[PDB]
Amino acid sequence: NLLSLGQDSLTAAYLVNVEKNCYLNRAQMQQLQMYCPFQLPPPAIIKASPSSTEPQWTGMQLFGMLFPPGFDYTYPLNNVVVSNGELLSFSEGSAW
Amino acid sequence: IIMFEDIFVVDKLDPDGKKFDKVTRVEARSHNLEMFMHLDVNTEVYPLAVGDKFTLAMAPTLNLDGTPDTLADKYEYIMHGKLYKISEKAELYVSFGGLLMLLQGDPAHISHFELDQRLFLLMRKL
Amino acid sequence: TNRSTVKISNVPQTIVADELLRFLELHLGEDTVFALEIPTTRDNWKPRDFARVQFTTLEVKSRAQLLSSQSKLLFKTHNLRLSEAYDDIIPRPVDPRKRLDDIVLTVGFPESDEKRFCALEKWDGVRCWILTEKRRVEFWVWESGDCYKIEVRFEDIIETLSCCVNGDASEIDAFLLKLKYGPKVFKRVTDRYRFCKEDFDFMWIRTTDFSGSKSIGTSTCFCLEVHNGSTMLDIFSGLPYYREDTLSLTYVDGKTFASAAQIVPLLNA
Amino acid sequence: SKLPANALSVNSKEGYFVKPSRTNIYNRVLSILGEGITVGPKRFEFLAFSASQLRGNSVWMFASNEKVKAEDIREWMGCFRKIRSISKCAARMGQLFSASRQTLIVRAQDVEQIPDIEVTTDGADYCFSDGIGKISLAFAKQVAQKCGLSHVPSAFQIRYGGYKGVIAVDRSSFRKLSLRDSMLKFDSNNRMLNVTRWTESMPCFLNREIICLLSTLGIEDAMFEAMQAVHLSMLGNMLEDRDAALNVLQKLSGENSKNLLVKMLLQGYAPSSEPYLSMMLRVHHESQLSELKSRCRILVPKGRILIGCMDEMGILEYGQVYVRVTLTKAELKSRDQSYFRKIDEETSVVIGKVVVTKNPCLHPGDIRVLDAIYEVHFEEKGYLDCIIFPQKGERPHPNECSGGDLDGDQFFVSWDEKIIPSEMDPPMDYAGSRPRLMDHDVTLEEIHKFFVDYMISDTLGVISTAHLVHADRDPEKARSQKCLELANLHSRAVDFAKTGAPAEMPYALKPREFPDFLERFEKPTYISESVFGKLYRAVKSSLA
Amino acid sequence: SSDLQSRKNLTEEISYGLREAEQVCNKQQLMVESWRDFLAVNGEDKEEDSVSDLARFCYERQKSATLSELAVSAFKDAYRDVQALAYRYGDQSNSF
């Protein structure tokens, strides 16, 4: 490919895929959905504390709204698995 | 309504830290069933220490008697994920939006789980 | 309970031995840590992820294990996990009673049929350590600066006799060790990650006899001039083939039997 | 006990490289070897040390006397200034110390020089005639008169005047003595004749090495388990049955041996009676079971261990030999077999596929299947208790067995038809290290230095154990590069006695784990699931 | 670093690593045909003279080209481990 994200979308994607501990609530997720072509995935995080309402989304599902539903990707070196347009697993490497 | 339910006891943690601000992979060995489990639990939000006992349950839906896709008052660590690999003492691979889970137990204990299905994760620390 | 050395599972890579020693002394009792060594993959600039610490008393080790089992040890956001080790940092018995310092050590053999014992050479201020797990007894003799280690196994000694040096029959102040084989002789030869609480930065190599008159090579029995020892008989009861009898000896002037040749125990022509 | 490696020349890192530092014990040993031990009115010097004593850390000493001194015996045994090697000179000086029986004296005028054979294939020097020789019938009868031998052996190990090697009986000899070229080790001042051993038709055994290397060609564990079980069943009934006792005594130790207990075994009272023989039988059974627990020693009746030689015929091609042995009780009971030919009443020929191996073996290529062939011309010469190796071929058969030589060494022969001959593996190369030749004569100090240095860097005993453990651990044993490296190191260590080349055992190749069938109780013991583990479990269940 | 003690430990470790790298470079500089008698497994009494002259190694290196290239390669090989200390002494949230 000739066109690639230059260091900025790269840094943001690395941060959103490495942290895995900074969850996004409904308001922030809906605000960020305005800039994404596809729809919203399930929250996948219903409760994180015994007294915590407002189920939140995870960081890796935010990056999964950029992939088409019929897109399959696999990068064994970084343990990246994309199925049905959803990013399932990612360990480290920042090479994909 | 619940496919799997057993009492688990944690054995060790991968980071072994208190304020690492990172996901911690837990290794809990089941009782009376001899099952080994891997799970990524955020210690900063949900504290878990080595030696504590907790229960774990998986159900296809949170509604009572149907309506796939009120168990909120009982459990406190409800999650949602998908099982994408069953073939391996069978083992499971469920991703909760990037939080990998490995459930390696017995072949007869894990037999009612279909491939590419949505299942929940109900957990309570007694 | 066999050894007091405990292996720590994970420690931060940026710490030094002094910091860990201070942390342990803060959580545990004061100066309760004897030795602490952190292995390094390089000479002095790359420590490993684990470390080994030797405590002074078994109760301290049990308390540390109990604290580690409850995850009460948090040193720089790291949980210290404790496990048993293979060998101790220093071969030191964990007992305040088996450590004897400043005692008289002499070697010799019975002279005649009577209960008499001749002294070939006498050493003062030696250190005796009794190790039960290793089944050996060490004797540290300082001679002209450099120290020597004399090791006697439990199989080399065939009989243990309790005697006295002051002549009083009611005060056992000596112990004769009938040796069948010969004792091993060692010699001492000449820091940021090793505290060790002492100057033990040396190694032991096997050398020949160091006595000028070669008294050790021609003596098959040892003598340990000790104090009254009200409770010392219990410690000495662990030696194999111990005699529960009281015997008296008489010192005999046997300094004439001194050979400067390489082959010591041969008779003079 | 044996002096450990750390007690002499402990390692230390000084400067850029690691330089060993000699200890005081090293200097003490050197001083003792130099000056000598002074006991009373005597002072013992140093004469020499044999090859067996080099491994045992022993040496002979002789007190100097007015009539004869150490130098007198040294110059009487031979001139050792021709050899410029340190280890080789000591080996050739100490080789003349084995026990032998005296016989007649042969002069130096009855000698001859016959050419040998040497073939170079693929740039490799392969020599067939290493220690072979010839002997006549009259000379054999004359030698066999002073030792009391009725049957004249076809081959026997002999050595005289520095020569060493086995000689064969030929029916077309000129005189009583014949000599070859590649046999003179050193020039000696005397030519006294003496023999060590002639021939013994002892039944062979299956050691740990053979079973380890035979677990890859395709031999299953069922046959080994069945054979071990039937052996244990026969041994268990040996006590209460007199018939089994004679059969066991006539097929385990000694093919033709006369003993007081052997004679009474065939005809005697009940095992309950005669306590003198009963206690001996019980202690023999206990010794046998203890030896079985210590090491695998399977008793097979269809195999022997005998020396071999070559004949000047050239009819046998590459892979064709002649097998002949005596007839035991089992052979005499039923001699009708497909692979057994009854050439005579006492000697029976074999027609089966027989493999040949040596006592030490760590390479899968040592296994070579040889087909026995019967010929009237070979039988006319009268050969017995001697495997006939072919004279012509590409590579010599002794070289195939880990580079062996014809110096009276025993060979493993078994005419069993249950082995798998389909799999074949080329043997390892027998190319040794380059010899070390000095520019001057030995000053009697370098030999002492070599003798003392043999104690250190001596890993002959640990390489075999490490190889056995590694073969036990991983599957497809004796196929990986680790086993090949272990075999090479073992060969180099075996060659260390002749050439001063240390084995250099690596630290990472140590086992660190020991199976159940070892006496290393202090070392960590792990459960073994191989054929040896099955045998150990079976014997433990049988004894319990 | 997290505090001053960590900074001091890192400085000491860097100094020791640089010293070890320099020693490795000096050792590698001896792989020439002039030291074949010293590199052999024999008895040489000039072992102390090879380490006593520390300042002469720099002059010998800077006057040659092949020796300089070998020294550079050895220094890079020994300095990779020195560079590998930032992951140990650095935090996860480090921007660099």
UniProtKB/Swiss-Prot annotation, chain A:
Coiled coil segments of this chain: none
Phenotype on disruption: Blocked in the perpetuation of CNN, CG and CNG methylation in repeated endogenous DNA accompanied by a reduction in long 24-26 nt siRNAs. Transient loss of post-transcriptional gene silencing (PTGS) in young leaves. Reduction of heterochromatin association into chromocenters, coincident with losses in cytosine methylation at pericentromeric 5S gene clusters and AtSN1 retroelements. Altered cell-to-cell movement of siRNAs beyond the vasculature. Release of transposon silencing. Not impaired RNA-directed DNA methylation-dependent (RdDM) silencing.
Chain segments annotated as transmembrane: none
Organism: Arabidopsis thaliana
Biological classification of the source: Eukaryota, Viridiplantae, Streptophyta, Embryophyta, Tracheophyta
Family: Belongs to the RNA polymerase beta' chain family.
Subunit structure and binding partners: Component of the RNA polymerase IV complex. Interacts with NRPD2, NRPD3, NRPD3B, NRPD4, NRPD5, NRPD5B, NRPD6A, NRPD7, NRPD7B, NRPD9A, NRPD9B, NRPD10, NRPD11, NRPD12, RDR2, RDM4, CLSY1, CLSY2, CLSY3, CLSY4 and SHH1.
Gene that encodes the chain: NRPD1
Tissues and organs where the protein is expressed, per its UniProt entry: Mostly expressed in flowers, and, to a lower extent, in leaves.
Full-sequence portion shown in this chain: 485 to 580 of 1453
Name of the protein in question: DNA-directed RNA polymerase IV subunit 1
Annotated compartments: Nucleus
Curated annotation (Swiss-Prot), chain B:
A Pfam short name: RNA_pol_Rpb8
Gene Ontology terms: biological process: DNA-templated transcription
Keywords recorded for this protein, A-Z: Nucleus
Primary localization: nucleus
Transmembrane segments: none
Cross-referenced SMART domains: RPOL8c (SM00658)
GO molecular function, one term: DNA-directed RNA polymerase activity
GO CC term, one of those recorded: RNA polymerase V complex
Cellular compartments annotated: Nucleus
Family label: Belongs to the eukaryotic RPB8 RNA polymerase subunit family.
Subunit field text: Component of the RNA polymerase II, IV and V complexes. Associates with the mediator complex.
Biological role: DNA-dependent RNA polymerase catalyzes the transcription of DNA into RNA using the four ribonucleoside triphosphates as substrates. Component of RNA polymerase II which synthesizes mRNA precursors and many functional non-coding RNAs. Pol II is the central component of the basal RNA polymerase II transcription machinery. It is composed of mobile elements that move relative to each other.
Full protein name: DNA-directed RNA polymerases II, IV and V subunit 8B
Organism: Arabidopsis thaliana
Lineage: Eukaryota, Viridiplantae, Streptophyta, Embryophyta, Tracheophyta
UniProtKB/Swiss-Prot annotation, chain C:
Gene Ontology molecular-function annotations: DNA/RNA hybrid binding; metal ion binding; RNA-directed RNA polymerase activity; single-stranded RNA binding
Keywords: Magnesium, Metal-binding, Nucleotidyltransferase, Nucleus, RNA-binding, RNA-directed RNA polymerase, RNA-mediated gene silencing, Transferase
A cellular component term, taken from the record's GO annotations: nucleoplasm
Outcome of gene disruption: Late flowering and absence of siRNAs derived from FWA tandem repeat regions. Loss of de novo methylation. Increased expression of retrotransposon-derived solo long terminal repeat (solo LTR) and SDC due to their derepression; levels are even higher in the double mutant rdr2-1 jmj24-1.
Localization in the cell: Nucleus, Nucleoplasm; Nucleus, Nucleolus; Nucleus
Top-rank taxon: Eukaryota
Known function: RNA-dependent direct polymerase involved in the production of small interfering RNAs (siRNAs). Binds to single-stranded RNA (ssRNA); engages ssRNAs longer than 7 nucleotides and initiates internal to their 3' ends. Able to transcribe the RNA of an RNA/DNA hybrid, the transcript produced by Pol IV, if its 3' end is accessible, to generate double-stranded small interfering RNAs (dsRNAs) precursor essential for establishing and maintaining DNA methylation.
Protein name: RNA-dependent RNA polymerase 2
Organism expressing this protein natively: Arabidopsis thaliana (Mouse-ear cress)
Gene name in the database record: RDR2
UniProtKB/Swiss-Prot annotation, chain D:
Highest rank taxon of the organism: Eukaryota
Deleted gene: phenotype: Late flowering and absence of siRNAs derived from FWA tandem repeat regions. Loss of de novo methylation. Increased expression of retrotransposon-derived solo long terminal repeat (solo LTR) and SDC due to their derepression; levels are even higher in the double mutant rdr2-1 jmj24-1.
Subcellular location: Nucleus, Nucleoplasm; Nucleus, Nucleolus; Nucleus
Binding site for Mg(2+): D405, D407, D409
Family: Belongs to the RdRP family.
General function of this protein: RNA-dependent direct polymerase involved in the production of small interfering RNAs (siRNAs). Binds to single-stranded RNA (ssRNA); engages ssRNAs longer than 7 nucleotides and initiates internal to their 3' ends. Able to transcribe the RNA of an RNA/DNA hybrid, the transcript produced by Pol IV, if its 3' end is accessible, to generate double-stranded small interfering RNAs (dsRNAs) precursor essential for establishing and maintaining DNA methylation.
Subunit record text: Interacts with NRPD1 and SHH1. Associates with Pol IV complex, forming an interpolymerase channel bridging their active sites, through which the Pol IV-generated transcript is handed over to the RDR2 active site after being backtracked, where it is used as the template for double-stranded RNA (dsRNA) synthesis. Interacts with JMJ24.
Further facts: RDR2 is non-functional in the absence of associated Pol IV.
